[PDB]
Amino acid sequence: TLGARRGLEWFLGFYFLSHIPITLLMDLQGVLPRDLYPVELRNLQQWYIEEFKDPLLQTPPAWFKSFLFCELVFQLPFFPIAAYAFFKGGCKWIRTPAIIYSVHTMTTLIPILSTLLLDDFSKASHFRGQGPKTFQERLFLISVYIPYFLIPLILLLFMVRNPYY
Amino acid sequence: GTLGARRGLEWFLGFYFLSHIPITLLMDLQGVLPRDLYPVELRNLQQWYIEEFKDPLLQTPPAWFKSFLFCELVFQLPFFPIAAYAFFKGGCKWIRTPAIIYSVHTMTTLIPILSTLLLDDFSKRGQGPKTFQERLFLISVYIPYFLIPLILLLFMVRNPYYK
Ligand SMILES: O=C(CN1CCC(CN2Cc3ccccc3C2=O)CC1)c1ccc(F)cc1
Ligand SMILES: O=C(CN1CCC(CN2Cc3ccccc3C2=O)CC1)c1ccc(F)cc1
């Protein structure tokens, strides 16, 4: 495996590269002041909220805000370092850091995916109206979060086993 | 003593993983397992803790908190006896990557728990901490499950006896 191994490294590199605009421009809007973001980016996030009926990014809970702070202080600095190593290739120094990132991101998203799939968004619940009401809406919203669990899982199994790391 | 700091932490982690088995099985998993699997005295004992210290998570377990409790059943509890043996015996390089995975996972589960106790509002959703002293007591009973895994992560990242 030398062509499929490098192709996975290119895929991981773009995942950590494209995560920098996504985290900065769309995700950190839930913790950073709204005055740091232009009006266009703020209205773009409201489009997503009403299109996908996301209950977490609008009125973010304290447990979700803790993960967004973890994304700013820990995950965001690692994205540029991770993209370089996987683009370059052969960087054995990224194995243990990538295992730390993979388990961390997977752990944050288990409660996130379990909330969207099972938690109740009825009028009695604290969400009070917002959120997915049908099952097709729950899959529609889960599909936005599920990449950030599968790709870190691929990275985890790729780091623990591959003798090149 | 003549154990040293390095051996003393190996023993310390062993008793941490050892005592984690009864604590998880008899107290934690009451939030995800049926009531009948537990004697009424264990359920009333946990109820005393919930009423006294105003635990909001154990009272009515939220969906996010229940997902971590299931991770404790499926992932952490099977790992507890394996890690206790590796650190009691000593010199087990095979525990490095597994214990790192446990450390990051447990630390990550505890971050939203501690942040909710400290900063969230429990006024207008069941009982919860009101005073800073009440939040401080609740942080004291959850904080060891963040510090000890953090010490473990730092212990496995750069100990040459495990690489
Ligand atoms: O919260 C995350 C990751 N988010 C990544 C962005 C996504 C929100 N989207 C998707 C989208 C598409 C088109 C236009 C606009 C948008 C838009 O706004 C919602 C999950 C997270 C990732 C890792 C982690 F550890 C914790 C949280
Ligand atoms: O949830 C935990 C750890 N809990 C350990 C048990 C504690 C709940 N208590 C404390 C107590 C004292 C006296 C009588 C009864 C009780 C009683 O019932 C509350 C945190 C956790 C640990 C690691 C992890 F990864 C996820 C969760």
mmCIF file of C-alpha atoms and ligand atoms in Angstrom:
data_model
loop_
_atom_site.group_PDB
_atom_site.id
_atom_site.type_symbol
_atom_site.label_atom_id
_atom_site.label_comp_id
_atom_site.label_asym_id
_atom_site.label_seq_id
_atom_site.Cartn_x
_atom_site.Cartn_y
_atom_site.Cartn_z
ATOM 1 C CA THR A 1 0.000 0.000 0.000
ATOM 2 C CA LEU A 2 1.928 3.002 -1.352
ATOM 3 C CA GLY A 3 -0.591 4.663 -3.676
ATOM 4 C CA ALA A 4 -3.574 4.125 -1.403
ATOM 5 C CA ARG A 5 -1.459 5.178 1.582
ATOM 6 C CA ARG A 6 -0.464 8.473 -0.057
ATOM 7 C CA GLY A 7 -3.997 9.091 -1.316
ATOM 8 C CA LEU A 8 -5.204 8.810 2.269
ATOM 9 C CA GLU A 9 -2.525 11.325 3.282
ATOM 10 C CA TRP A 10 -3.753 13.777 0.643
ATOM 11 C CA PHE A 11 -7.328 13.268 1.840
ATOM 12 C CA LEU A 12 -6.346 13.891 5.463
ATOM 13 C CA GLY A 13 -4.402 17.000 4.459
ATOM 14 C CA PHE A 14 -7.431 18.610 2.826
ATOM 15 C CA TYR A 15 -9.583 17.611 5.811
ATOM 16 C CA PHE A 16 -7.324 19.547 8.194
ATOM 17 C CA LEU A 17 -6.889 22.379 5.690
ATOM 18 C CA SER A 18 -10.593 22.891 4.973
ATOM 19 C CA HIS A 19 -11.314 22.628 8.709
ATOM 20 C CA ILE A 20 -9.590 25.987 9.304
ATOM 21 C CA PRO A 21 -12.160 28.083 7.372
ATOM 22 C CA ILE A 22 -15.036 25.972 8.724
ATOM 23 C CA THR A 23 -13.971 26.347 12.350
ATOM 24 C CA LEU A 24 -13.067 30.030 12.027
ATOM 25 C CA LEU A 25 -15.948 31.277 9.898
ATOM 26 C CA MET A 26 -18.886 29.071 10.882
ATOM 27 C CA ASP A 27 -18.287 27.136 14.094
ATOM 28 C CA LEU A 28 -16.637 29.638 16.447
ATOM 29 C CA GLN A 29 -19.568 32.019 15.926
ATOM 30 C CA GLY A 30 -21.195 30.265 18.903
ATOM 31 C CA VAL A 31 -18.481 31.301 21.394
ATOM 32 C CA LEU A 32 -16.687 34.307 19.911
ATOM 33 C CA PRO A 33 -18.422 37.710 19.940
ATOM 34 C CA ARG A 34 -20.679 38.414 16.982
ATOM 35 C CA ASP A 35 -18.828 41.711 16.400
ATOM 36 C CA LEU A 36 -15.782 39.817 15.110
ATOM 37 C CA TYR A 37 -17.865 38.416 12.207
ATOM 38 C CA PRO A 38 -19.231 40.374 9.226
ATOM 39 C CA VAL A 39 -22.973 40.584 8.647
ATOM 40 C CA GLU A 40 -22.732 38.206 5.681
ATOM 41 C CA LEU A 41 -21.129 35.376 7.662
ATOM 42 C CA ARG A 42 -23.639 35.814 10.483
ATOM 43 C CA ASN A 43 -26.561 35.598 8.066
ATOM 44 C CA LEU A 44 -24.964 32.553 6.434
ATOM 45 C CA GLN A 45 -25.059 30.683 9.744
ATOM 46 C CA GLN A 46 -28.727 31.581 10.241
ATOM 47 C CA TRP A 47 -29.426 30.117 6.802
ATOM 48 C CA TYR A 48 -27.855 26.825 7.891
ATOM 49 C CA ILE A 49 -29.780 26.873 11.183
ATOM 50 C CA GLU A 50 -33.164 27.295 9.480
ATOM 51 C CA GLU A 51 -32.267 24.948 6.592
ATOM 52 C CA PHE A 52 -31.062 22.041 8.759
ATOM 53 C CA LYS A 53 -32.996 22.891 11.968
ATOM 54 C CA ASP A 54 -29.809 22.749 14.040
ATOM 55 C CA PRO A 55 -30.582 23.208 17.768
ATOM 56 C CA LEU A 56 -26.948 23.251 18.940
ATOM 57 C CA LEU A 57 -25.337 26.079 16.967
ATOM 58 C CA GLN A 58 -28.272 28.389 17.747
ATOM 59 C CA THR A 59 -28.668 28.960 21.497
ATOM 60 C CA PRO A 60 -25.640 26.742 22.239
ATOM 61 C CA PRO A 61 -25.718 24.727 25.471
ATOM 62 C CA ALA A 62 -22.899 24.842 27.989
ATOM 63 C CA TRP A 63 -21.729 21.323 27.144
ATOM 64 C CA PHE A 64 -21.656 22.178 23.431
ATOM 65 C CA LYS A 65 -19.897 25.485 24.153
ATOM 66 C CA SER A 66 -17.187 23.572 26.014
ATOM 67 C CA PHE A 67 -16.476 21.566 22.846
ATOM 68 C CA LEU A 68 -16.379 24.735 20.738
ATOM 69 C CA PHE A 69 -13.817 26.195 23.142
ATOM 70 C CA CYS A 70 -11.849 22.946 22.853
ATOM 71 C CA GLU A 71 -11.987 23.412 19.078
ATOM 72 C CA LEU A 72 -10.480 26.904 19.388
ATOM 73 C CA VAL A 73 -7.712 26.228 21.909
ATOM 74 C CA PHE A 74 -6.720 22.662 20.944
ATOM 75 C CA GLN A 75 -8.081 21.526 17.571
ATOM 76 C CA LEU A 76 -7.632 24.731 15.557
ATOM 77 C CA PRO A 77 -3.859 25.064 16.269
ATOM 78 C CA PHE A 78 -3.370 21.412 15.272
ATOM 79 C CA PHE A 79 -5.049 21.769 11.852
ATOM 80 C CA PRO A 80 -2.133 23.654 10.189
ATOM 81 C CA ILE A 81 0.486 21.311 11.653
ATOM 82 C CA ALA A 82 -1.527 18.247 10.642
ATOM 83 C CA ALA A 83 -2.041 19.371 7.044
ATOM 84 C CA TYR A 84 1.700 19.903 6.537
ATOM 85 C CA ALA A 85 2.699 16.472 7.851
ATOM 86 C CA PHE A 86 0.136 14.510 5.824
ATOM 87 C CA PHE A 87 0.820 16.584 2.709
ATOM 88 C CA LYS A 88 4.569 16.058 3.120
ATOM 89 C CA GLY A 89 4.399 12.429 4.263
ATOM 90 C CA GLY A 90 6.611 10.264 6.448
ATOM 91 C CA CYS A 91 6.286 12.549 9.499
ATOM 92 C CA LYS A 92 6.393 9.993 12.301
ATOM 93 C CA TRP A 93 6.130 12.797 14.880
ATOM 94 C CA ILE A 94 2.408 13.235 14.147
ATOM 95 C CA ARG A 95 1.285 9.738 15.216
ATOM 96 C CA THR A 96 0.709 10.401 18.914
ATOM 97 C CA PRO A 97 -0.686 13.943 18.333
ATOM 98 C CA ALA A 98 -3.118 12.563 15.739
ATOM 99 C CA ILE A 99 -4.273 9.837 18.136
ATOM 100 C CA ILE A 100 -4.971 12.537 20.725
ATOM 101 C CA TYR A 101 -6.930 14.581 18.173
ATOM 102 C CA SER A 102 -8.866 11.568 16.839
ATOM 103 C CA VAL A 103 -10.094 10.303 20.216
ATOM 104 C CA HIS A 104 -10.908 13.864 21.285
ATOM 105 C CA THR A 105 -13.048 14.708 18.262
ATOM 106 C CA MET A 106 -14.809 11.334 18.243
ATOM 107 C CA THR A 107 -15.615 11.726 21.932
ATOM 108 C CA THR A 108 -17.116 15.189 21.425
ATOM 109 C CA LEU A 109 -19.472 13.975 18.694
ATOM 110 C CA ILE A 110 -20.979 10.898 20.357
ATOM 111 C CA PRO A 111 -23.152 13.126 22.611
ATOM 112 C CA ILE A 112 -23.731 15.507 19.699
ATOM 113 C CA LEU A 113 -25.043 12.743 17.429
ATOM 114 C CA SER A 114 -26.964 11.124 20.304
ATOM 115 C CA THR A 115 -28.691 14.437 21.062
ATOM 116 C CA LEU A 116 -29.848 14.973 17.479
ATOM 117 C CA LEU A 117 -31.018 11.386 17.083
ATOM 118 C CA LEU A 118 -32.715 10.700 20.433
ATOM 119 C CA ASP A 119 -33.249 13.878 22.478
ATOM 120 C CA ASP A 120 -36.730 15.396 22.288
ATOM 121 C CA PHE A 121 -37.212 18.796 20.633
ATOM 122 C CA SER A 122 -40.901 19.145 21.517
ATOM 123 C CA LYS A 123 -42.517 22.143 23.192
ATOM 124 C CA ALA A 124 -42.103 20.596 26.654
ATOM 125 C CA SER A 125 -38.326 20.362 26.196
ATOM 126 C CA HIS A 126 -36.039 23.285 27.025
ATOM 127 C CA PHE A 127 -35.276 23.777 23.313
ATOM 128 C CA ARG A 128 -38.814 25.192 23.014
ATOM 129 C CA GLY A 129 -39.581 24.802 19.338
ATOM 130 C CA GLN A 130 -36.274 24.619 17.455
ATOM 131 C CA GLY A 131 -34.778 21.347 16.269
ATOM 132 C CA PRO A 132 -35.634 18.447 13.964
ATOM 133 C CA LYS A 133 -39.169 17.090 14.276
ATOM 134 C CA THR A 134 -39.142 14.129 11.864
ATOM 135 C CA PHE A 135 -36.666 11.296 11.355
ATOM 136 C CA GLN A 136 -35.693 12.490 7.874
ATOM 137 C CA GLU A 137 -34.771 15.853 9.392
ATOM 138 C CA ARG A 138 -32.626 14.096 12.008
ATOM 139 C CA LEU A 139 -30.674 12.270 9.295
ATOM 140 C CA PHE A 140 -30.373 15.533 7.355
ATOM 141 C CA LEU A 141 -28.750 17.209 10.371
ATOM 142 C CA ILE A 142 -26.643 14.176 11.344
ATOM 143 C CA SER A 143 -25.107 14.049 7.860
ATOM 144 C CA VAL A 144 -23.501 17.437 8.566
ATOM 145 C CA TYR A 145 -21.812 16.231 11.762
ATOM 146 C CA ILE A 146 -21.025 12.613 10.795
ATOM 147 C CA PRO A 147 -17.904 13.475 8.702
ATOM 148 C CA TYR A 148 -16.123 14.738 11.818
ATOM 149 C CA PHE A 149 -16.558 11.334 13.474
ATOM 150 C CA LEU A 150 -15.767 9.030 10.537
ATOM 151 C CA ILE A 151 -12.632 10.814 9.325
ATOM 152 C CA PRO A 152 -11.069 10.975 12.832
ATOM 153 C CA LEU A 153 -11.944 7.284 13.163
ATOM 154 C CA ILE A 154 -10.160 6.500 9.891
ATOM 155 C CA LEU A 155 -7.178 8.496 11.146
ATOM 156 C CA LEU A 156 -7.218 6.608 14.450
ATOM 157 C CA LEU A 157 -7.045 3.141 12.884
ATOM 158 C CA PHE A 158 -4.515 4.446 10.346
ATOM 159 C CA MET A 159 -2.237 5.790 13.090
ATOM 160 C CA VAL A 160 -2.329 2.858 15.516
ATOM 161 C CA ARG A 161 -1.591 0.145 12.940
ATOM 162 C CA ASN A 162 0.492 1.530 10.065
ATOM 163 C CA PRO A 163 4.195 0.709 10.637
ATOM 164 C CA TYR A 164 5.151 3.867 8.715
ATOM 165 C CA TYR A 165 4.082 5.657 11.919
ATOM 166 C CA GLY B 1 9.806 5.355 50.358
ATOM 167 C CA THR B 2 12.131 3.311 48.146
ATOM 168 C CA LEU B 3 9.337 2.889 45.577
ATOM 169 C CA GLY B 4 10.111 6.274 44.030
ATOM 170 C CA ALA B 5 7.784 8.719 42.332
ATOM 171 C CA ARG B 6 7.565 6.735 39.085
ATOM 172 C CA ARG B 7 6.634 3.458 40.771
ATOM 173 C CA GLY B 8 4.336 5.320 43.164
ATOM 174 C CA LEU B 9 2.339 6.696 40.249
ATOM 175 C CA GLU B 10 2.216 3.228 38.658
ATOM 176 C CA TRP B 11 0.653 1.905 41.866
ATOM 177 C CA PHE B 12 -1.600 4.970 42.142
ATOM 178 C CA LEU B 13 -2.992 4.422 38.642
ATOM 179 C CA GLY B 14 -3.547 0.769 39.527
ATOM 180 C CA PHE B 15 -5.767 1.578 42.497
ATOM 181 C CA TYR B 16 -7.532 4.279 40.473
ATOM 182 C CA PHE B 17 -8.500 1.743 37.790
ATOM 183 C CA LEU B 18 -9.274 -0.841 40.481
ATOM 184 C CA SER B 19 -11.661 1.349 42.476
ATOM 185 C CA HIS B 20 -13.221 2.565 39.217
ATOM 186 C CA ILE B 21 -14.829 -0.854 38.704
ATOM 187 C CA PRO B 22 -17.124 -0.786 41.786
ATOM 188 C CA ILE B 23 -17.795 2.953 41.442
ATOM 189 C CA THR B 24 -18.942 2.651 37.828
ATOM 190 C CA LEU B 25 -20.893 -0.572 38.338
ATOM 191 C CA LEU B 26 -22.634 0.461 41.564
ATOM 192 C CA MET B 27 -23.124 4.214 41.099
ATOM 193 C CA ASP B 28 -22.478 5.568 37.606
ATOM 194 C CA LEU B 29 -24.403 3.006 35.556
ATOM 195 C CA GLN B 30 -27.561 3.682 37.593
ATOM 196 C CA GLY B 31 -28.176 6.480 35.083
ATOM 197 C CA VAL B 32 -28.415 4.104 32.107
ATOM 198 C CA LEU B 33 -29.306 0.664 33.526
ATOM 199 C CA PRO B 34 -32.712 -0.353 34.908
ATOM 200 C CA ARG B 35 -33.516 0.178 38.569
ATOM 201 C CA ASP B 36 -34.151 -3.488 39.377
ATOM 202 C CA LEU B 37 -30.536 -4.502 38.769
ATOM 203 C CA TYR B 38 -29.685 -2.412 41.875
ATOM 204 C CA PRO B 39 -30.737 -3.080 45.480
ATOM 205 C CA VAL B 40 -33.032 -0.454 46.933
ATOM 206 C CA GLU B 41 -30.318 0.560 49.417
ATOM 207 C CA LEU B 42 -27.918 1.485 46.605
ATOM 208 C CA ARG B 43 -30.621 3.511 44.858
ATOM 209 C CA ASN B 44 -31.567 5.344 48.048
ATOM 210 C CA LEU B 45 -27.883 5.983 48.765
ATOM 211 C CA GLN B 46 -27.366 7.672 45.396
ATOM 212 C CA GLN B 47 -30.602 9.585 46.000
ATOM 213 C CA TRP B 48 -29.129 10.962 49.230
ATOM 214 C CA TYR B 49 -26.139 12.255 47.264
ATOM 215 C CA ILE B 50 -28.348 13.827 44.592
ATOM 216 C CA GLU B 51 -30.499 15.649 47.156
ATOM 217 C CA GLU B 52 -27.611 16.770 49.367
ATOM 218 C CA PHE B 53 -25.161 18.016 46.743
ATOM 219 C CA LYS B 54 -27.751 19.085 44.120
ATOM 220 C CA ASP B 55 -26.378 16.956 41.292
ATOM 221 C CA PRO B 56 -28.279 18.029 38.139
ATOM 222 C CA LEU B 57 -26.737 15.406 35.865
ATOM 223 C CA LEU B 58 -27.473 12.317 37.964
ATOM 224 C CA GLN B 59 -31.002 13.470 38.849
ATOM 225 C CA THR B 60 -32.412 13.484 35.295
ATOM 226 C CA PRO B 61 -29.578 12.299 33.039
ATOM 227 C CA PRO B 62 -29.415 14.372 29.848
ATOM 228 C CA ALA B 63 -28.896 12.702 26.492
ATOM 229 C CA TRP B 64 -25.281 13.857 26.194
ATOM 230 C CA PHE B 65 -24.468 12.657 29.719
ATOM 231 C CA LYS B 66 -26.168 9.300 29.069
ATOM 232 C CA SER B 67 -24.004 8.754 25.979
ATOM 233 C CA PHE B 68 -20.845 9.067 28.088
ATOM 234 C CA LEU B 69 -22.330 6.656 30.629
ATOM 235 C CA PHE B 70 -22.770 4.090 27.856
ATOM 236 C CA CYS B 71 -19.168 4.685 26.767
ATOM 237 C CA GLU B 72 -18.189 3.862 30.351
ATOM 238 C CA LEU B 73 -20.047 0.548 30.142
ATOM 239 C CA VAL B 74 -18.879 -0.534 26.689
ATOM 240 C CA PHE B 75 -15.387 1.018 26.496
ATOM 241 C CA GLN B 76 -13.996 2.074 29.877
ATOM 242 C CA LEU B 77 -15.146 -0.715 32.197
ATOM 243 C CA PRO B 78 -13.578 -3.520 30.071
ATOM 244 C CA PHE B 79 -10.323 -1.541 30.036
ATOM 245 C CA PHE B 80 -10.203 -0.980 33.818
ATOM 246 C CA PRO B 81 -8.925 -4.463 34.842
ATOM 247 C CA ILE B 82 -6.428 -4.566 31.964
ATOM 248 C CA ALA B 83 -4.909 -1.221 32.964
ATOM 249 C CA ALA B 84 -4.911 -2.060 36.678
ATOM 250 C CA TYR B 85 -2.850 -5.182 35.947
ATOM 251 C CA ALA B 86 -0.417 -3.377 33.640
ATOM 252 C CA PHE B 87 0.347 -0.704 36.250
ATOM 253 C CA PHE B 88 0.329 -3.019 39.286
ATOM 254 C CA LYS B 89 2.754 -5.468 37.662
ATOM 255 C CA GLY B 90 4.857 -2.709 36.105
ATOM 256 C CA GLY B 91 6.864 -2.514 32.904
ATOM 257 C CA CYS B 92 4.017 -3.022 30.413
ATOM 258 C CA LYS B 93 4.843 -1.115 27.230
ATOM 259 C CA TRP B 94 1.684 -2.471 25.555
ATOM 260 C CA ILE B 95 -0.464 -0.115 27.659
ATOM 261 C CA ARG B 96 0.977 3.086 26.122
ATOM 262 C CA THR B 97 -1.330 3.690 23.160
ATOM 263 C CA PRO B 98 -4.375 2.097 24.901
ATOM 264 C CA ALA B 99 -4.012 4.229 28.048
ATOM 265 C CA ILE B 100 -3.491 7.351 25.928
ATOM 266 C CA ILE B 101 -6.789 6.593 24.171
ATOM 267 C CA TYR B 102 -8.485 6.212 27.558
ATOM 268 C CA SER B 103 -6.928 9.417 28.932
ATOM 269 C CA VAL B 104 -8.047 11.660 26.069
ATOM 270 C CA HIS B 105 -11.495 10.043 25.994
ATOM 271 C CA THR B 106 -12.105 10.460 29.726
ATOM 272 C CA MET B 107 -10.697 14.013 29.833
ATOM 273 C CA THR B 108 -12.938 14.949 26.917
ATOM 274 C CA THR B 109 -16.024 13.509 28.624
ATOM 275 C CA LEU B 110 -15.302 15.486 31.811
ATOM 276 C CA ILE B 111 -14.824 18.893 30.144
ATOM 277 C CA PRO B 112 -18.568 19.475 29.488
ATOM 278 C CA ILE B 113 -19.448 17.980 32.893
ATOM 279 C CA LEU B 114 -17.256 20.384 34.872
ATOM 280 C CA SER B 115 -18.125 23.369 32.669
ATOM 281 C CA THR B 116 -21.851 22.768 33.128
ATOM 282 C CA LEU B 117 -21.490 22.547 36.916
ATOM 283 C CA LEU B 118 -19.441 25.753 37.052
ATOM 284 C CA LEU B 119 -21.142 28.040 34.509
ATOM 285 C CA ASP B 120 -24.600 26.709 33.611
ATOM 286 C CA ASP B 121 -27.871 27.962 35.106
ATOM 287 C CA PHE B 122 -30.153 25.644 37.076
ATOM 288 C CA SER B 123 -32.920 28.086 38.023
ATOM 289 C CA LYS B 124 -35.857 28.199 35.608
ATOM 290 C CA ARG B 125 -35.215 22.292 34.958
ATOM 291 C CA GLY B 126 -35.053 20.393 38.237
ATOM 292 C CA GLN B 127 -32.762 20.916 41.195
ATOM 293 C CA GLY B 128 -29.263 22.276 40.730
ATOM 294 C CA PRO B 129 -26.438 24.226 42.355
ATOM 295 C CA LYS B 130 -27.218 27.838 43.231
ATOM 296 C CA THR B 131 -24.320 29.077 45.371
ATOM 297 C CA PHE B 132 -20.657 29.021 44.398
ATOM 298 C CA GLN B 133 -19.990 26.765 47.398
ATOM 299 C CA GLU B 134 -22.527 24.254 46.079
ATOM 300 C CA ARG B 135 -20.914 24.219 42.628
ATOM 301 C CA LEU B 136 -17.507 23.823 44.271
ATOM 302 C CA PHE B 137 -18.557 20.686 46.160
ATOM 303 C CA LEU B 138 -19.937 19.121 42.969
ATOM 304 C CA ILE B 139 -16.737 19.920 41.085
ATOM 305 C CA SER B 140 -14.737 18.183 43.822
ATOM 306 C CA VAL B 141 -16.512 14.855 43.208
ATOM 307 C CA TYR B 142 -16.012 15.000 39.412
ATOM 308 C CA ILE B 143 -12.558 16.624 39.179
ATOM 309 C CA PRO B 144 -10.465 13.481 39.987
ATOM 310 C CA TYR B 145 -11.752 11.776 36.825
ATOM 311 C CA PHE B 146 -10.151 14.613 34.837
ATOM 312 C CA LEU B 147 -6.864 15.118 36.686
ATOM 313 C CA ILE B 148 -5.869 11.456 37.011
ATOM 314 C CA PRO B 149 -6.367 10.704 33.276
ATOM 315 C CA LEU B 150 -4.492 13.935 32.495
ATOM 316 C CA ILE B 151 -1.567 12.772 34.655
ATOM 317 C CA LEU B 152 -1.787 9.413 32.871
ATOM 318 C CA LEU B 153 -1.638 11.096 29.452
ATOM 319 C CA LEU B 154 1.416 13.104 30.493
ATOM 320 C CA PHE B 155 2.846 9.907 31.986
ATOM 321 C CA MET B 156 2.529 7.932 28.731
ATOM 322 C CA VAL B 157 3.479 10.644 26.224
ATOM 323 C CA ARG B 158 7.138 10.855 27.241
ATOM 324 C CA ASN B 159 8.007 7.958 29.588
ATOM 325 C CA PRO B 160 10.794 6.024 27.797
ATOM 326 C CA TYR B 161 9.881 2.866 29.760
ATOM 327 C CA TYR B 162 6.701 2.546 27.651
ATOM 328 C CA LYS B 163 7.781 3.631 24.143
HETATM 329 O O1 LIG C 1 -19.421 21.854 15.342
HETATM 330 C C1 LIG C 1 -18.542 21.191 14.822
HETATM 331 C C2 LIG C 1 -18.434 21.107 13.308
HETATM 332 N N1 LIG C 1 -19.389 21.860 12.498
HETATM 333 C C3 LIG C 1 -18.927 22.045 11.125
HETATM 334 C C4 LIG C 1 -19.862 22.990 10.372
HETATM 335 C C5 LIG C 1 -21.335 22.585 10.403
HETATM 336 C C6 LIG C 1 -22.212 23.777 10.109
HETATM 337 N N2 LIG C 1 -22.384 24.217 8.726
HETATM 338 C C7 LIG C 1 -22.352 23.316 7.572
HETATM 339 C C8 LIG C 1 -22.632 24.251 6.432
HETATM 340 C C9 LIG C 1 -22.792 24.008 5.075
HETATM 341 C C10 LIG C 1 -23.072 25.057 4.215
HETATM 342 C C11 LIG C 1 -23.188 26.347 4.703
HETATM 343 C C12 LIG C 1 -23.024 26.603 6.056
HETATM 344 C C13 LIG C 1 -22.749 25.542 6.918
HETATM 345 C C14 LIG C 1 -22.589 25.514 8.391
HETATM 346 O O2 LIG C 1 -22.626 26.441 9.178
HETATM 347 C C15 LIG C 1 -21.717 22.092 11.796
HETATM 348 C C16 LIG C 1 -20.682 21.193 12.450
HETATM 349 C C17 LIG C 1 -17.550 20.451 15.651
HETATM 350 C C18 LIG C 1 -16.519 19.719 15.074
HETATM 351 C C19 LIG C 1 -15.585 19.069 15.862
HETATM 352 C C20 LIG C 1 -15.706 19.161 17.222
HETATM 353 F F1 LIG C 1 -14.793 18.520 18.001
HETATM 354 C C21 LIG C 1 -16.706 19.865 17.834
HETATM 355 C C22 LIG C 1 -17.634 20.512 17.038
HETATM 356 O O1 LIG C 2 -19.831 9.912 36.338
HETATM 357 C C1 LIG C 2 -18.645 9.677 36.480
HETATM 358 C C2 LIG C 2 -18.058 9.505 37.873
HETATM 359 N N1 LIG C 2 -18.998 9.578 38.990
HETATM 360 C C3 LIG C 2 -18.520 8.889 40.182
HETATM 361 C C4 LIG C 2 -19.639 8.804 41.220
HETATM 362 C C5 LIG C 2 -20.306 10.139 41.566
HETATM 363 C C6 LIG C 2 -21.687 9.904 42.130
HETATM 364 N N2 LIG C 2 -21.796 9.571 43.550
HETATM 365 C C7 LIG C 2 -20.903 10.108 44.579
HETATM 366 C C8 LIG C 2 -21.468 9.508 45.834
HETATM 367 C C9 LIG C 2 -21.107 9.673 47.164
HETATM 368 C C10 LIG C 2 -21.813 9.013 48.156
HETATM 369 C C11 LIG C 2 -22.872 8.186 47.826
HETATM 370 C C12 LIG C 2 -23.239 8.010 46.501
HETATM 371 C C13 LIG C 2 -22.531 8.683 45.506
HETATM 372 C C14 LIG C 2 -22.738 8.730 44.040
HETATM 373 O O2 LIG C 2 -23.576 8.154 43.371
HETATM 374 C C15 LIG C 2 -20.471 10.996 40.313
HETATM 375 C C16 LIG C 2 -19.291 10.953 39.359
HETATM 376 C C17 LIG C 2 -17.747 9.550 35.297
HETATM 377 C C18 LIG C 2 -16.402 9.225 35.421
HETATM 378 C C19 LIG C 2 -15.610 9.048 34.300
HETATM 379 C C20 LIG C 2 -16.185 9.204 33.068
HETATM 380 F F1 LIG C 2 -15.422 8.992 31.962
HETATM 381 C C21 LIG C 2 -17.499 9.540 32.898
HETATM 382 C C22 LIG C 2 -18.282 9.714 34.025
#
